[PDB]
Amino acid sequence: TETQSLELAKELISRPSVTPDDRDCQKLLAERLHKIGFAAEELHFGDTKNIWLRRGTKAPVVCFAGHTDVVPTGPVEKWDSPPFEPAERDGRLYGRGAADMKTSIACFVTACERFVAKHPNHQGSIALLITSDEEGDALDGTTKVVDVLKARDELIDYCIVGEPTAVDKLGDMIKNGRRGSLSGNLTVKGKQGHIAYPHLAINPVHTFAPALLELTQEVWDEGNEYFPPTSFQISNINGGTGATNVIPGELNVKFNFRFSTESTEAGLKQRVHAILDKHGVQYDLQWSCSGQPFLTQAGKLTDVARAAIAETCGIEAELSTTGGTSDGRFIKAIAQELIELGPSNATIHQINENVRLNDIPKLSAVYEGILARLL
Amino acid sequence: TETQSLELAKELISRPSVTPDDRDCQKLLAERLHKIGFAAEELHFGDTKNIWLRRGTKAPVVCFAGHTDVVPTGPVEKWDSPPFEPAERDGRLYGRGAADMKTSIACFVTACERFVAKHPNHQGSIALLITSDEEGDALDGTTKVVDVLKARDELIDYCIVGEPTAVDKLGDMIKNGRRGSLSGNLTVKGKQGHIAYPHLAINPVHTFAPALLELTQEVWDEGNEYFPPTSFQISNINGGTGATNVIPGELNVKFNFRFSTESTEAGLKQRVHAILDKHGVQYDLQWSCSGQPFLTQAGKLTDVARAAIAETCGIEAELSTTGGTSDGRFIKAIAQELIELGPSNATIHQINENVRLNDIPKLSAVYEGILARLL
Numbered sequence: 001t002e003t004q005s006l007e008l009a010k011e012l013i014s015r016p017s018v019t020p021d022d023r024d025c026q027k028l029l030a031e032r033l034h035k036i037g038f039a040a041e042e043l044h045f046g047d048t049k050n051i052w053l054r055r056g057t058k059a060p061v062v063c064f065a066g067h068t069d070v071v072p073t074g075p076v077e078k079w080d081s082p083p084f085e086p087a088e089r090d091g092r093l094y095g096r097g098a099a100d101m102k103t104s105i106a107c108f109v110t111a112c113e114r115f116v117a118k119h120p121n122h123q124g125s126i127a128l129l130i131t132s133d134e135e136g137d138a139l140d141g142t143t144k145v146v147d148v149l150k151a152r153d154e155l156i157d158y159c160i161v162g163e164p165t166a167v168d169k170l171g172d173m174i175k176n177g178r179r180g181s182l183s184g185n186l187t188v189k190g191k192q193g194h195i196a197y198p199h200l201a202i203n204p205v206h207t208f209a210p211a212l213l214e215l216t217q218e219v220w221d222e223g224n225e226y227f228p229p230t231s232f233q234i235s236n237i238n239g240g241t242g243a244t245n246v247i248p249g250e251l252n253v254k255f256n257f258r259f260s261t262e263s264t265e266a267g268l269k270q271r272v273h274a275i276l277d278k279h280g281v282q283y284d285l286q287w288s289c290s291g292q293p294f295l296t297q298a299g300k301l302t303d304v305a306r307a308a309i310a311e312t313c314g315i316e317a318e319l320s321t322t323g324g325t326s327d328g329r330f331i332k333a334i335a336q337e338l339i340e341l342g343p344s345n346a347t348i349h350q351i352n353e354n355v356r357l358n359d360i361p362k363l364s365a366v367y368e369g370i371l372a373r374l375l
Numbered sequence: 376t377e378t379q380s381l382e383l384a385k386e387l388i389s390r391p392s393v394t395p396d397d398r399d400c401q402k403l404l405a406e407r408l409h410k411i412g413f414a415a416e417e418l419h420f421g422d423t424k425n426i427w428l429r430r431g432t433k434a435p436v437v438c439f440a441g442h443t444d445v446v447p448t449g450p451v452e453k454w455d456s457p458p459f460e461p462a463e464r465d466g467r468l469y470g471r472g473a474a475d476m477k478t479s480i481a482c483f484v485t486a487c488e489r490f491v492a493k494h495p496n497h498q499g500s501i502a503l504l505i506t507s508d509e510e511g512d513a514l515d516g517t518t519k520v521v522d523v524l525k526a527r528d529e530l531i532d533y534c535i536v537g538e539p540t541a542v543d544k545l546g547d548m549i550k551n552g553r554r555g556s557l558s559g560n561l562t563v564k565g566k567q568g569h570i571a572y573p574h575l576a577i578n579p580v581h582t583f584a585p586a587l588l589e590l591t592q593e594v595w596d597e598g599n600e601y602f603p604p605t606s607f608q609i610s611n612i613n614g615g616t617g618a619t620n621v622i623p624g625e626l627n628v629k630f631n632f633r634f635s636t637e638s639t640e641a642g643l644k645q646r647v648h649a650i651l652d653k654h655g656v657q658y659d660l661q662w663s664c665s666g667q668p669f670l671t672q673a674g675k676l677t678d679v680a681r682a683a684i685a686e687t688c689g690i691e692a693e694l695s696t697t698g699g700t701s702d703g704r705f706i707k708a709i710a711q712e713l714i715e716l717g718p719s720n721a722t723i724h725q726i727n728e729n730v731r732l733n734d735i736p737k738l739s740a741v742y743e744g745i746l747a748r749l750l
């Protein structure tokens with residue numbers, strides 16, 4: 001039906017907002033929604049731009065959240081059409097950010113427009129929480145805006161993060177949470193020496209081997225109705241001097257857990273240390289946690305999104321926690337219920353990123369359906 | 376007693392014959408031994424210098440073998456006295472090559488001088504096989520000279536390689552053979568992907584882990600009266616893109632066997648392949664063999680060196696095959712019996728390399744003792 005969502009998505013995709021630059025996407029959003037009574041609050045931090053746009057002063061507060069930054073395109077000539085000149089081809093819209101996640105943003109802005117026109121006196125409030133750094137280190141984006149909101153007791157009842165969540169067809173999957181991510185940087189200590197005198201050296205690959213095996217065979221947990229089993233995966237392993245006749249004196253290993261609520265950050269660290277210690281490994285281990293798992297169990301928000309998807313798309317949406325993470329991990333601190341909902345994530349962060357054209361007005365009509373069922 | 380060995384060792388150590396340069400060490404040897412009837416045959420190949428010096432035309436042929444090249448010194452200011460200005464200090468002679476292996480060469484040249492003076496009409500022949508590349512890739516040194524000798528049926532009955540073999544005191548250890556060295560370069564194949572979708576990737580660290588453990592726990596053989604058990608050791612392991620949220624698509628591992636005659640090159644390769652295949656690992660594996668094990672069992676030559684050491688040094692020498700390897704692995708093809716015998720190897724290839732001064736005339740008197748018992 002409407003082509004306003006498509007037209008706005010094109011205009012957004014045409015701006016090369018590679019992290020953390022915004023290229024005035026947030027200005028364009030702010031000025032457009034100002035016309036139907038969204039107040040704009042700019043929250044810049046370091047080189048990152050953020051905005052909190054809000055219509056209304058009372059509960060329930062429904063927030064759309066998302067990012068105007070996009071990942072680099074890589075060599076442009078490898079693309080079939082230029083990444084920042086959105087093109088319609090074979091029933092798809094192609095461009096960097098077409099899926100992740102400018103089309104969602106456009107769809108939400110138009111849903112707000114249609115909803116407010118139909119229901120000028122609706123109850124509650126509608127807000128957008130938009131960052132120009134989700135894709136980078138994200139130290140100065142959403143997480144800083146959330147802290148500001150929380151410090152002034154400006155809380156959210158329902159949040160929809162517009163990340164692409166579909167497997168294939170729009171609405172087939174929504175996310176009601178994500179795994180936490182806990183990473184370790186392990187340095188196993190041995191003693192370097194000539195390879196032909198192994199009794200005078202300590203080979204850190206050999207001392208690590210029995211622990212490595214136990215770690216990669218370990219069952220961390222069962223998962224549950226909402227989460228898959230916690231996952232351990234080694235990303236990098238490096239040891240040696242490059243000489244083929246030397247035993248190295250240390251070995252570096254980097255690993256990560258994507259963990260469910262069935263396990264805790266402290267529990268996992270303890271188990272790793274205990275595995276390494278059981279096998280007599282000598283090491284340094286530095287940990288870093290980029291996020292705790294978060295979960296909105298079945299409730300009004302999940303029911304509403306499901307009903308909206310059933311009405312617009314004709315399919316039964318699956319709730320999921322799989323994949324990576326998003327800025328929902330920050331926003332959940334101030335949102336009582338939060339989900340993520342957007343188009344297919346199949347082509348994100350890749351050349352020839354795209355979204356099906358027929359999915360664009362459908363997405364907006366889903367978001368408009370949600371607003372109508374909550375407000 | 377005599378100080379001729381010391382004086383010649385100094386003169387040799389003063390020439391900076393870093394591989395494959397000889398700095399005229401071989402000329403100095405050739406001209407000096409020419410005076411007592413050694414004929415000199417220069418055998419240059421590529422950038423390496425070699426010489427075969429020989430007195431006599433009949434069996435038994437006793438050969439001293441060794442190298443005039445030395446390893447780099449590293450930053451000179453870290454040395455206590457300059458590496459190519461031999462110094463006497465605290466009862467030691469210090470300099471690059473003092474132990475490995477110019478002092479041996481000097482000691483042998485003086486032993487020849489004293490032996491020929493005492494026994495001008497001795498039977499048999501005395502030869503020196505000297506290279507300026509043992510320490511490097513050694514493609515153009517001893518191995519090419521041996522091929523020349525073998526092609527003209529010029530064989531050796533008894534060979535003494537002047538490598539430093541002592542643990543501490545001169546004569547405490549002689550080598551009657553060495554382990555072979557068989558190296559593998561393994562590339563384990565997986566499939567790269569985002570770490571949070573492990574079921575869509577293949578982690579080559581994880582597929583390798585059970586094989587790694589089995590390899591580092593494997594007992595290859597028992598060893599025997601002459602050899603220690605065969606030894607497997609990983610030298611290098613590298614995999615990953617540097618990103619902590621990516622599963623890598625491959626893993627490189629470099630490993631080495633120092634193997635005894637109880638195992639064969641082909642047998643070891645087979646066992647490795649079978650371990651990797653039992654665990655379903657997918658990989659490429661390139662092998663390289665830099666040497667087969669070699670062994671002179673107890674016989675005239677070992678008995679003679681032992682008796683000479685007992686007479687000169689007053690101790691019972693141990694036969695050994697431990698450590699790295701030497702150019703005996705080439706010369707054994709043309710020498711019926713071969714041993715290695717020299718001073719302490721404790722400080723070889725290190726800063727402040729040295730030899731005990733009292734060991735220098737003793738070494739020469741050992742070599743002279745050997746010549747007298749064989750010729």
Ligand SMILES: C[C@H](CS)C(=O)N1CCC[C@H]1C(=O)O
Pocket residue numbers: 100134163164322323324325326345348569
């Ligand atoms: C929310 C992010 C896009 S910014 C996402 O969906 N990712 C990022 C990595 C993989 C993929 C996924 O979770 O499926």
Ligand SMILES: C[C@H](CS)C(=O)N1CCC[C@H]1C(=O)O
Pocket residue numbers: 194475509538539697698699700701720723
């Ligand atoms: C024959 C060589 C010196 S060129 C040697 O003894 N090496 C070389 C590496 C270690 C040490 C050893 O075997 O003990």
Ligand SMILES: [Zn+2]
Pocket residue numbers: 071100135348349
């Ligand atoms: Zn993204």
Ligand SMILES: [Zn+2]
Pocket residue numbers: 067100101134163164
């Ligand atoms: Zn995104």
Ligand SMILES: [Zn+2]
Pocket residue numbers: 446475510723724
């Ligand atoms: Zn050496």
Ligand SMILES: [Zn+2]
Pocket residue numbers: 442475476509538539
């Ligand atoms: Zn040497």
